[PDB]
């Protein structure tokens, strides 16, 4: 509604990529026969 609150919200949201918690994901696909391919997904977080 008011300009000031939206301006502050925009400026604060601009820093999300720095302030937010880092995350990582690693997907490992192992080559197996008999159309049986297990998957190994490891996600690393720092809560």
């Amino acid at each position: 509604d008011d300009e000031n609150i939206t301006k502050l919200n925009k400026e604060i949201r601009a820093f999300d990529k720095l302030l937010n918690i880092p995350r990582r994901e690693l997907k490992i696909n192992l080559p197996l026969t008999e159309h049986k391919s297990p998957n190994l997904s490891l996600m690393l977080e720092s809560p």
Partner: protein, 253 residues
């Protein structure tokens, strides 16, 4: 339920801009736009409430207020999207006409609120009023609608109006409001606060028994009033004007 301690006043639109600047010089905050829509409901006269204890006057019938916020997309006409959404738009709101008409409000049909006449006695420096409040979050059923709900309780619609203005937040929980009020009917829309702004400064107290807090609140309100001496005169309104019981009809506007 709160004890609201309030002071009132009015100003002509000519000084409006100037007034705004002075407020920002004191509070250190910028104004924030807001709007609202209030509907007043009264007990149904078709039903005879013999339960009013006439020989004892345990209670008297009263009026219920239902309030809701309405987005500005209903209040801005085709000539006004160019300007940004800030307080200056109020400078164009001097005509008795307004984009929101009767049909849209009828299509709409929240916060439920009841109040009492202020405390008696002539040794009161600020208007002290008691308010009982609740909130309606949602509903369901075959007739889920505000009108059907209030008819289920036993109340019927009386009138409605629209407030548009600005808000200032100061220290100690003090809130200062500049308002413009538009009454709405099928016949049309009429601005009761014609050529001016209604000013209201108030604080809320959660518990009426605490008296140290009430004394502090009164001290803050009187200090604020004594700060604005010479520019605007803030006064205690008439105790008989803020009475909203059905038996006697008048409306401070």
């Amino acid at each position: 339920m709160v004890q609201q301690l309030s002071l009132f006043g009015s100003i002509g639109d000519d000084g409006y801009d100037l007034l705004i600047s002075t407020l920002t010089t004191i509070s250190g905050n910028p104004p924030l736009l807001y709007n609202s829509l209030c509907t007043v409901w009264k007990p149904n006269p078709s039903y005879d409430v013999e339960n009013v204890n006439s020989r004892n006057q345990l209670v008297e019938p009263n009026r219920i207020k239902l309030s809701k916020e309405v987005p500005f997309s209903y209040l801005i006409d085709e000539t006004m999207m160019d300007k940004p959404l800030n307080f200056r738009i109020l400078k164009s709101f001097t005509n008795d006409k307004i984009p929101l008409n009767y049909a849209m409000t009828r299509n709409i049909l929240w916060s439920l609120q009841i109040s009492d006449i202020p405390a008696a006695g002539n040794n009161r420096s600020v208007s002290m009023q008691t308010i009982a409040e609740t909130i309606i979050l949602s509903s369901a059923g075959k007739n889920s609608s505000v009108s059907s709900l209030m008819n289920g309780l036993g109340y019927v619609f009386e009138f409605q109006y629209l407030t548009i203005g600005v808000k200032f937040f100061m220290k100690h929980g003090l809130i200062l409001e500049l308002q413009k009020i538009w009454q709405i009917e099928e016949a049309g829309n009429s601005q009761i606060t014609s050529g001016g702004f209604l000013l209201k400064a108030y604080i809320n107290v959660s518990r009426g028994t605490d008296i140290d807090r009430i004394n502090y609140t009164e001290t803050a309100l009187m200090n604020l009033k004594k700060e604005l001496q010479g520019y605007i005169e803030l006064s205690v309104p008439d105790r008989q004007s803020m009475d909203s019981r059905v038996a006697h009809g008048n409306i401070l506007i």
